[PDB]
Design a protein around this ligand. Structure first.
Ligand SMILES: Nc1ncnc2c1ncn2[C@@H]1O[C@H](COP(=O)(O)OP(=O)(O)OP(=O)(O)O)[C@@H](O)[C@H]1O
Ligand SMILES: Nc1ncnc2c1ncn2[C@@H]1O[C@H](COP(=O)(O)OP(=O)(O)OP(=O)(O)O)[C@@H](O)[C@H]1O
Ligand SMILES: Nc1ncnc2c1ncn2[C@@H]1O[C@H](COP(=O)(O)OP(=O)(O)O)[C@@H](O)[C@H]1O
Ligand SMILES: [Mg+2]
Ligand SMILES: [Mg+2]
Ligand SMILES: [Mg+2]
Lengths: 102, 73, 96, 92, 51, 279, 97, 384
């Protein structure tokens, strides 16, 4: 019970901090550098925090960038591939062999 | 209201326009045909009415438009 | 000439104006036009309006060589292989 | 049409009586039907137009059952549907 | 295409999907860049009623 | 003490409020949301709020400075609201229309019957259409028929114009589209109506002028939203047009427009009925 | 109200269709009004097929105008006058009774 | 690094050892002089402190921009992504030699000062029309011609392999080559063989793609294509089915038939303009040469014209021998019967007949092909 109460008070305290942007990474660089592009602004070349490895940062992925220093923070789940969007737009009515007559 | 000078090329039309500009004492405006064509929509008439209003501001102003067939096709 | 065929309306005249402004900025130097028979043949507007924006580009080019303080200290020279299709108003002395 | 470009060409002739009956059988499952319809007569009525209009006849026969507030489909609806579909395709 | 586990792609020359292929796509072979990463794929084009 | 402590956290709700759209929830008490300012954010969720109300496209209220998720909000909309029936019923009856019984019956069967007698549609298994289209030469009853349907219906009626979805400030088009669909879905078995689609749904797009990008985004949002229904919500979309040849084929696929109705010129028999009814 | 059809167009995305909606709202407020628009061929021309960009905006304004007059909502005590010296190019829908 | 190319001895003579010893002594003296200040009066780290302080000055948030104009006194006007442009200064550690208008410049976040230059981003059209690996086997698979091969070799291969024969008597290699003749005769196959054998970069494009749906896009394509070809390396440009740009008209084209003329004028300009051409070889192929503009194929642009006639009986037998080298032919079949199948039979019909006969044998699950397979294959292919 005591742990719950103290956690509640600290959670009240820690809700007045800035948010973090989401962005798309285009490609990485050497010595812990990546290039990202967030839509309501240009392209930014930034660094990576000490708990994220470059080899995990594949090109064309979603990441979270801090506010003051734009440093890499997390990796967002994913982004829908263009092929999926195109095929959902076309809407081809798939079928199978059992719907064949003569 | 207005005058219109026409004929084959090489005859002194622009010469008369320049002589009239030199001899007269009022305000004189020079304008060309293709100069009034703009890329954005609604940005061509704006220049025309602005030029006419500026000419109206100074009472005795006159205007001379050259190569009229570039617009009045 | 093939560089003056643009996609949007009213771009060729702008390019010609910029060319002559840049030329006038310096003291005195030359301009070369290659394959002039692609930027204007003759005014022939019949029926539906076809091939007349290029006529506006040609008209701006004509206007920049005469009337109300011509370009002055600029010398141009042009070449073509079929000169039978050029406009009458461009071949008069004072320009060519 | 040069011989070395396209490696095979396949033809799709309009369905005959057996193929029309097969398509009718395939596309007649999605509806609440009644025991005994004699689909052979319905297939024979169609003068072999195409394979899409068989589906159209099947999907429009149920509207006649709906128009009388019913829960089962009888072959009178099939005959009315095929007659209307074949006649109304003459125009245009 | 479905029974043999192949990526089904169809092209119709439209312009809504033009943003999903390339920014300008002055050519047409650029689709292969999007196709060869789904190697066992099939391209299907249907002639319109104009012919 | 815990009862007192649970109440002091409501200090961050008074004035600082901005309305935004919930986008995704990566994990517990943390999400990504897009404010109406025009940018997205990866923010932290307040603990005491009920997580059950966080639906895909719900509207929420965020702190102004810390920009953190604070409150959920009841449904809200803009644009045309309800056609509130006071000065909205257009007092045009079915009797004033004469001669187009075929189109009248087609519209009735494709619109009104699924709204009321859904059980028969499910039992026979005929898959009622999601929407209809009207095409034909100008002057032949499309607007009058829509008007009569609006007068005689018992369900909610939303009417819009295809030329209103374009706005000076970027980002208002998809917002208005998803907003009107959200209201129509969460209010009642309503009916959406669009006049003159041709303003937004064409075939040619030029991705360099800026306006065409906006129209493309609006149209893609419309396609995405109208495909999202689960064949369980009683919602029908009636859309009218005049020049049917200048339409994008991607909008006529099954599940989006299953019915096409043409309004042709009267020939011999409708003329007498029109004359007698009018005179 | 007195206006020329070629002076209500501008390069912004929605202003062209907003101005006409505003003027019809103003006319609706003060119920007895007369609207006169000179040179209707500037924006009332026929709608192109396979047309160019920056030209479908004029068509958008055109169908907005066509919906404002004789649309879903009836007008009352409002009359309009139009003038043109070549009516060939007008849209078939605008000339409809 | 071309420090000393004088290695003319290239043997166990004293000259090579003496030259190597002199170069080594000079390099050792230079290294000792360079390290004298590095070990005697360092006065600082001079190795890691410099990078540390240049990183300290260069903040961790780092934006991008595009050059517009530059003034001589080490500053320039750069435009931001939003649209605003500034009058920032240029730092002195930014190797100001590759600063070119339009290049992506890396700027600071506080005062937007120029702090770096960023590399390019490849291009999504180079990989589209560049050949990566060799298509197939070399001239040994052709057979029949044996005479056009020497001409194409003289036009392309010899200057690359032996740029000495031309230098003995001072002539230039022929400029252009064009291949014409009836269809299905082996022009694209010879282009494949040339692409396989050669070592220069190979660029190809179909002539039907030179017409676009906007105004003034064809000339832009031609300009950009030739810029790419001239900027990579000694290269080869292959344009086939060029005549199709004029014998077909599409309603998708916004302009009429004049845009084709403008594209032609741009193509002539690129082929024989007045600026330095560099080293680019052009190969053209068509089957209707009577419809091209003569001014396009004048000497000085296309220097060689090569015709491909229909094969004769000997070439027909040779093509049978080539295309059935890996097929298990039964003793019943004879090629002489199929030689007289048609009066004007071409090379492609041979491969078509052989392939479809193999398919028909595969249908019945038979490894060996019989005479009836060929008898039905020829009728199924040719007669329709
Ligand atoms: N029975 C009738 N059938 C058709 N039109 C009628 C009938 N009775 C009267 N009308 C008149 O015909 C017109 C109907 O046109 P309506 O408003 O339906 O436009 P529309 O055909 O949809 O064309 P648009 O493309 O202009 O929207 C009105 O002027 C109406 O008064
Ligand atoms: N002389 C030949 N030797 C070997 N194979 C040949 C010969 N001529 C034609 N072929 C066969 O024909 C096939 C197609 O030839 P190719 O497409 O290169 O012809 P082409 O001259 O470019 O004709 P087109 O202009 O009609 O496309 C080759 O892949 C090859 O199998
Ligand atoms: N007396 C004259 N009458 C006509 N033209 C003259 C006369 N004297 C000189 N010119 C020359 O004729 C040209 C006048 O330009 P103009 O013929 O008006 O061109 P355009 O008719 O194409 O506008 C100038 O080059 C001018 O030097
Ligand atoms: Mg003059
Ligand atoms: Mg209407
Ligand atoms: Mg070939």
């Amino acid at each position: 019970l005591n742990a719950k109460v103290r956690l509640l008070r600290e959670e009240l305290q820690l809700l007045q901090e800035q948010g973090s942007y989401v962005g798309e990474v285009v490609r990485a660089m050497d010595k812990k550098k990546v290039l990202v592009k967030v839509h309501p602004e240009g392209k930014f070349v930034v660094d990576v925090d000490k708990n994220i490895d470059i080899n995990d940062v594949t090109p064309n992925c979603r990441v979270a960038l801090r506010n003051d220093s734009y440093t890499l923070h997390k990796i967002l789940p994913n982004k829908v591939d263009p092929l999926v969007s195109l095929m959902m737009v076309e809407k081809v009515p798939d079928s199978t062999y059992e719907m064949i007559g003569g | 209201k207005g005058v219109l000078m026409y004929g084959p090329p090489g005859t002194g039309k622009t010469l008369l326009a320049r002589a009239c500009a030199a001899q007269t004492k009022a305000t004189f405006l020079k304008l060309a045909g293709p100069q009034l064509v703009q890329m954005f929509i609604g940005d061509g008439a704006k220049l025309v009415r602005d030029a006419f209003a500026l000419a109206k501001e100074k009472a005795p102003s006159i205007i001379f438009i050259d190569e009229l067939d570039a617009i009045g096709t | 000439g093939s560089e003056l065929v643009q996609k949007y309306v009213g771009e060729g005249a702008r390019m010609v104006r910029e060319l002559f402004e840049m030329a006038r900025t310096k003291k005195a130097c030359l301009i070369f036009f290659d394959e002039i028979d692609a930027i204007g043949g003759a005014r022939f507007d019949d029926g539906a309006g076809g091939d007349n924006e290029v006529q506006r580009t040609m008209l701006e080019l004509i206007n920049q060589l005469d009337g109300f303080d011509p370009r002055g200290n600029i010398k141009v020279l042009m070449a073509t292989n079929r000169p039978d299709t050029l406009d009458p108003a461009l071949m008069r002395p004072g320009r060519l | 049409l040069r011989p070395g470009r396209i490696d095979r060409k396949i033809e799709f002739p309009p369905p005959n009586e057996e193929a029309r009956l097969d398509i009718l059988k395939i596309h007649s499952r999605k509806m609440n039907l009644t025991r005994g319809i004699n689909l052979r007569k319905i297939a024979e009525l169609m003068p072999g137009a195409s394979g899409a209009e068989v589906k159209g006849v099947c999907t429009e026969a149920g509207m006649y059952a709906l128009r009388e507030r019913r829960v089962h489909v009888t072959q009178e609806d099939f005959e009315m549907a095929v007659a209307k579909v074949m006649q109304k395709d003459s125009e245009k | 295409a479905h029974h043999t586990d192949c990526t089904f792609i169809r092209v119709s020359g439209s312009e809504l999907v033009q943003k999903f292929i390339g920014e300008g796509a002055r050519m047409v072979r650029e689709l292969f860049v999007m196709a060869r990463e789904h190697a066992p794929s099939i391209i299907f084009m249907d002639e319109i009623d104009s012919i | 003490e815990f009862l007192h402590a649970q109440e002091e956290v409501k200090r961050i709700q008074s004035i600082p409020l901005v309305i935004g759209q919930f986008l995704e929830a990566v994990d517990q008490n943390t999400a990504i949301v897009g404010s109406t300012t025009g940018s997205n954010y990866y923010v932290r969720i307040l603990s005491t709020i009920d997580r059950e109300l966080l639906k895909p496209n719900a509207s929420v209220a965020l702190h102004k400075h810390s920009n953190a998720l604070v409150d959920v909000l009841p449904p809200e909309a803009d644009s045309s609201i309800m056609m509130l029936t006071s000065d909205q019923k257009p007092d045009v009856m079915y009797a004033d229309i004469g001669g187009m019984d075929i189109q009248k019956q087609e519209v009735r069967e494709a619109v009104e019957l699924p709204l009321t007698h859904f059980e028969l549609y499910k039992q026979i298994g005929i898959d009622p259409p999601r929407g209809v289209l009207m095409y034909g030469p100008p002057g032949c009853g499309k607007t009058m028929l829509a008007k009569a349907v609006a007068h005689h219906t018992t369900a909610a009626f939303i009417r819009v114009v295809g030329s209103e979805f374009v706005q000076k400030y970027l980002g208002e088009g998809p917002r208005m589209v998803r907003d009107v669909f959200r209201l129509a879905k969460e209010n009642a078995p309503a009916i959406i109506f669009i006049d003159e689609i041709d303003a937004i749904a064409t075939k040619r797009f030029d991705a360099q002028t800026g306006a065409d990008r906006e129209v493309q985004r609006i149209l893609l949002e419309l396609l995405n939203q109208m495909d999202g229904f689960d064949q369980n919500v009683n919602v029908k979309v009636i859309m009218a047009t005049n020049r049917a040849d200048t339409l994008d084929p991607a909008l006529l696929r099954p599940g989006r427009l299953d019915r096409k109705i043409e309004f042709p010129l009267p020939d011999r028999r409708q003329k007498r009925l029109i004359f007698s009814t009018i005179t | 109200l007195k206006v020329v059809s070629s002076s209500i167009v501008d390069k912004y995305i929605g202003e062209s269709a907003r101005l006409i909606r505003e003027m019809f709202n103003y006319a609706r407020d003060h119920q007895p009004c007369i609207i006169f628009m000179d040179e209707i061929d500037a924006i009332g021309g026929r709608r192109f097929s396979e047309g160019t960009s920056a030209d479908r905006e004029i068509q958008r304004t055109l169908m907005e105008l066509l919906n404002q007059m004789d649309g879903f909502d009836t007008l009352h005590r409002v009359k309009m006058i139009m003038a043109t010296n070549r009516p060939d190019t007008l849209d078939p829908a605008l000339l409809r009774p | 690094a071309s420090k000393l190319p004088l290695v003319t001895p290239h043997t166990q003579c004293r000259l090579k050892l003496l030259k190597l010893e002199r170069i080594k002594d000079y390099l050792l003296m230079e290294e000792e002089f360079i390290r004298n200040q590095e070990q005697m009066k360092p006065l600082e780290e001079k190795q890691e402190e410099e990078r540390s302080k240049v990183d300290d000055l260069r903040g961790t948030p780092m934006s991008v921009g595009t050059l517009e104009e530059i003034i001589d006194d080490n500053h320039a006007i750069v435009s931001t992504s939003v649209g605003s442009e500034h009058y920032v200064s240029i730092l002195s550690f930014v190797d100001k030699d590759l600063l070119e208008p339009g290049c992506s410049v890396l700027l600071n976040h506080k005062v937007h000062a120029v702090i770096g230059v960023l590399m390019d981003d490849t291009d999504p059209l180079v990989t589209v029309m560049k050949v990566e690996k060799a298509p197939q086997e070399t001239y040994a698979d052709i057979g029949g011609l044996d005479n056009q091969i020497q001409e194409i070799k003289e036009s392309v291969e010899l200057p690359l392999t032996h740029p000495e024969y031309y230098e003995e008597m001072g002539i230039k290699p022929p400029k252009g080559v064009i291949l014409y003749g009836p269809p299905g005769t082996g022009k694209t196959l010879l282009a494949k063989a040339v692409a396989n054998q050669t070592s220069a970069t190979f660029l190809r494009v179909v002539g039907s793609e030179l017409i676009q749906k906007y105004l003034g896009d064809g000339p832009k394509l031609v300009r950009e294509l030739f810029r790419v070809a001239e900027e990579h390396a000694p290269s080869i440009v292959f344009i086939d089915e060029i005549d199709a740009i004029g014998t077909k008209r599409y309603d998708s084209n916004s302009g009429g038939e004049r845009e084709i003329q403008r594209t032609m004028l741009e193509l002539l300009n690129q082929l024989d303009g007045f600026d330095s051409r560099g080293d680019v070889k052009v190969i053209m192929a068509t089957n209707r040469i009577e419809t091209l503009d003569p001014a396009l194929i004048r000497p000085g642009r296309i220097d060689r014209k090569i015709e491909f006639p229909l094969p004769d009986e000997k070439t027909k037998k040779r093509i049978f021998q080539i295309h059935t080298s890996r097929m298990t032919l039964a003793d019943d079949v004879t090629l002489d019967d199929l030689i007289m199948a048609k009066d004007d039979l071409s090379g492609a019909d041979i491969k078509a007949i052989c392939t479809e006969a193999g398919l028909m044998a595969l249908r019945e699950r038979r490894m060996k092909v019989t005479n009836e397979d060929f008898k039905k294959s020829k009728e199924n292919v040719l007669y329709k």
